[PDB]
Copies of this chain bind each other. A is one copy, B any other.
């Protein structure tokens, strides 16, 4: 019904616009409540514990569920932080399965998208060295997220910027210019100037 609905919003009859506007709110709040109803069920910590499952499939659906939550609002992020995901995720940064590595990267990018304190919980979980090492990485998939992540962290305060520098970003970042990839080339400039 969604696409009809997006038209009843552009309608002249006020019972039409109202009707459709309510349905849109119902759709939007039902979805948000399914999501909140998972955070509130107490799963996050058990999920976080499954990040170190011996079974790599279990590991991956768990990391997927987490990174999904961590893609939400500043409080879904907090619940993910509060359940102690940051260390586990940072650990997963040094993984052989480049799919697990790349998913953990993306979650950490999202968690570092929020407020300066959350960027700091990330910095405290010791992501920085792990994230600086992945700049050298040969796989451009990763190099790119790795760089996004540090750029997100470059966007925090004086003492986030200082820890990025303090962990070795300046050189690597600097020598990324000479990378064939044009979007990478660019993204480094942006990261450097934030830092200064």
Contact surface of A with B, Cβ cutoff 8 Å: 2-3, 5-6, 9-10, 14, 17-18, 21-22, 24-25, 27-35, 37-38, 41-43, 46-47, 49-50, 53, 55, 57-58, 61-62, 64-65, 68-69, 71-74, 110, 113-116, 152, 155, 157
A50-B21 Cα distance, complex, nearest whole Å: 9
Which residues on the B side are within 8 Å of A42 (C-beta)? 6
Q: Chain B contacts of A47 at CB under 8 A?
A: 9, 21, 24
Asked if A9 contacts B64 (CB within 8 A), the reply is: no
A157 to chain B, nearest CB (A): 6
With A25-B61, A58-B21 known as contacts, the answer to whether A6 contacts B46 (CB < 8 A) is yes
- Cβ distance A173 to chain B, nearest Cβ, rounded Å: 18
Residues of B contacting A18 in the complex (Cβ-Cβ under 8 angstroms): 55, 57-58, 61
Q: How far is the CB of A149 from chain B (nearest CB, A)?
A: 13
Q: Considering the chains assembled together, what is the distance between the CA atoms of A173 and B13 in angstroms? A: 45
Taking CB atoms, residues of chain B closer than 8 Å to A46 are 6, 9-10
A31 to chain B, nearest CB (A): 4
How close is A195's CB to chain B, nearest CB, in angstroms?
11
Across the interface, do B155 and A43 meet the contact criterion of CB distance under 8 Å? Answer: no
Residues of B contacting A72 in the complex (Cβ-Cβ under 8 angstroms): 32, 72-73
**Closest residue on chain B to residue A33 by CB atoms:** B31
**Most B CB within 10 A of own CB, among A24, A29, A71, A114:** A24
